[PDB]
Amino acid sequence: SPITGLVYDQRMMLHHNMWDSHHPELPQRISRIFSRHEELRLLSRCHRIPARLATEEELALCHSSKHISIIKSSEHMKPRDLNRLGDEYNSIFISNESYTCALLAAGSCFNSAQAILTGQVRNAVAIVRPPGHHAEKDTACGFCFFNTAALTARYAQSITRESLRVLIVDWDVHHGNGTQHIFEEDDSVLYISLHRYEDGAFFPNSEDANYDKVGLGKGRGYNVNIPWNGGKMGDPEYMAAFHHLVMPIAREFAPELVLVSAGFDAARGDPLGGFQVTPEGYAHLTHQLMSLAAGRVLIILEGGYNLTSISESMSMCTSMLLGDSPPSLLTPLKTSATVSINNVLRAHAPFWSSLR
Numbered sequence: 001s002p003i004t005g006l007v008y009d010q011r012m013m014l015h016h017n018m019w020d021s022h023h024p025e026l027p028q029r030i031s032r033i034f035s036r037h038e039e040l041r042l043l044s045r046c047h048r049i050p051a052r053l054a055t056e057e058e059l060a061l062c063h064s065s066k067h068i069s070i071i072k073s074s075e076h077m078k079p080r081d082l083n084r085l086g087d088e089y090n091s092i093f094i095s096n097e098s099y100t101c102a103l104l105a106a107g108s109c110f111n112s113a114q115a116i117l118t119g120q121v122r123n124a125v126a127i128v129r130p131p132g133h134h135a136e137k138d139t140a141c142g143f144c145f146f147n148t149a150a151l152t153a154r155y156a157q158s159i160t161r162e163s164l165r166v167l168i169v170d171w172d173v174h175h176g177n178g179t180q181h182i183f184e185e186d187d188s189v190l191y192i193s194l195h196r197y198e199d200g201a202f203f204p205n206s207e208d209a210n211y212d213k214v215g216l217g218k219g220r221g222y223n224v225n226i227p228w229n230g231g232k233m234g235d236p237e238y239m240a241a242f243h244h245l246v247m248p249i250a251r252e253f254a255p256e257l258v259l260v261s262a263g264f265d266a267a268r269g270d271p272l273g274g275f276q277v278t279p280e281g282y283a284h285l286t287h288q289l290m291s292l293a294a295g296r297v298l299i300i301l302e303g304g305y306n307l308t309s310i311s312e313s314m315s316m317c318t319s320m321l322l323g324d325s326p327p328s329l330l331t332p333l334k335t336s337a338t339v340s341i342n343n344v345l346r347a348h349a350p351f352w353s354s355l356r
C-alpha cells in the first residue's frame with residue numbers, strides 16, 4: 001500500500017533528568033515534533049502504528065545480557081543510585097522511567113519495520129526518545145541506552161532473512177559509534193554516517209569516526225564515515241556528500257530496507273551541533289533516499305535539540321515520505337568539505353565501482 005506510517009507515544013516523555021530539568025534531551029522533543037505534524041495536517045495523512053515494548057530477547061539481537069540487566073535494574077533505583085549508575089557512562093542521565101522509554105522507542109521501530117516489510121505501509125516515521133545510535137553492545141552512551149536503529153535492522157532480518165540488505169544512513173551530527181561497531185564485520189548492513197569530527201574534538205571524540213574506518217573482514221567497505229572538519233557545514237555540503245558518496249554507494253549496495261538514524265542536530269539553530277542544514281535540506285535528503293529499496297524507508301528520530309528546528313525538519317521529512325513535491329533549494333562548498341569528500345572517495349574507491 002502507498003501509505004506512510006507514523007508512530008508516536010507520549011509515554012516516551014517520561015524519561016527525564018531529575019537533576020537538571022533543562023538538559024537538552026527534553027521530553028518535549030517528541031511532543032513538539034508530534035504537535036507540528038498535527039499543525040501541518042500531516043498526522044491525519046499517516047497510518048498510525050502503535051508503540052510497543054521491545055522484549056529482552058529482541059534487545060539481545062545487539063546487546064549483552066549484562067547490559068540489558070544493568071539498565072533494567074535502574075527501574076527501581078533511588079535517586080543517588082540512578083546518579084551513580086548514570087555516571088558510569090559517558091553523557092547519560094537515568095530516571096526510573098528510562099528503561100521503559102528505551103523499550104518503547106525500540107518496539108515502536110520494530111512495529112514500523114514490520115508494517116513496511118509486511119506491505120501495510122510503504123514508508124514510515126518514528127518519533128521516539130531516548131535516542132539510540134551511541135549505544136554499544138555492552139554499554140550506554142551519549143543519551144542512548146539501546147541501539148534502536150541497529151536493533152531494528154536485526155529485527156528486520158529476523159522476520160525475512162539473515163542476509164536482508166539494510167542500509168542505515170545516519171545524518172545525526174554525531175557519529176553513531178554504536179551502530180558502526182555493531183555492524184563493523186557485517187556485509188548485510190551498510191552503515192553510512194555523516195558527522196562533525198574536528199579531528200576528534202567533537203563528541204564522541206574517537207578516531208573510530210574517521211574516513212579510513214571502512215569496516216572489517218567480510219564487512220570491509222560496508223562502513224562509510226563522512227567526517228566534517230573546520231566548523232559550520234550546511235545544505236551545500238550535505239547535498240554534495242549525498243551526490244558523490246551516499247547515493248552512488250547506496251545504489252550499488254541495492255538495499256532492501258533503508259533506516260535513517262535521523263538526528264536533527266545538524267540543523268540550523270541547534271546549539272549542540274553548530275551546523276546549518278535547513279528543513280528544505282532535510283527534505284531533499286529524504287527525497288533522495290526514497291529512490292532506494294522501492295521506497296521502503298523508516299525515519300527514526302535520534303538527536304536534535306532546537307525544538308523549533310527539529311519540529312520543522314522532521315515534519316518536512318514526513319511530507320516527503322507522503323509524496324509531497326520537494327521544496328526549492330549550487331553554492332560552493334567550504335574547502336575543508338571538499339577535502340573530506342575526496343578523502344572518503346579515496347578510502348572507498350577500492351570497494352565501490354560507482355566511485356571510480
Ligand SMILES: CC(/C=C/C(=O)NO)=C\[C@@H](C)C(=O)c1ccc(N(C)C)cc1
Pocket residue numbers: 023024091131133134142143172173174203263265272302303304
Ligand atoms: C552527548 C551529546 C550528544 C548526543 C547526541 O546528540 N548524539 O547523537 C552532546 C554533548 C557532548 C553536548 O554537546 C552537551 C551540551 C550541553 C549539555 N548540557 C547543557 C547538559 C550536555 C551535553
Ligand SMILES: [Cl-]
Pocket residue numbers: 072073074075076
Ligand atoms: Cl527493576
Ligand SMILES: [K+]
Pocket residue numbers: 170171172173174175176193194195
Ligand atoms: K551521523
Ligand SMILES: [K+]
Pocket residue numbers: 183184185186187189190191215219222223
Ligand atoms: K557494516
Ligand SMILES: [N+]
Pocket residue numbers: 038040041042043044
Ligand atoms: N489535519
Ligand SMILES: [N+]
Pocket residue numbers: 052053
Ligand atoms: N506496554
Ligand SMILES: [N+]
Pocket residue numbers: 078079080081
Ligand atoms: N537513597
Ligand SMILES: [N+]
Pocket residue numbers: 180181184208213215
Ligand atoms: N569499527
Ligand SMILES: [N+]
Pocket residue numbers: 250251252253254255
Ligand atoms: N540499486
Ligand SMILES: [N+]
Pocket residue numbers: 244338341342
Ligand atoms: N569532490
Ligand SMILES: [Zn+2]
Pocket residue numbers: 172173174263265302303304
Ligand atoms: Zn547527535
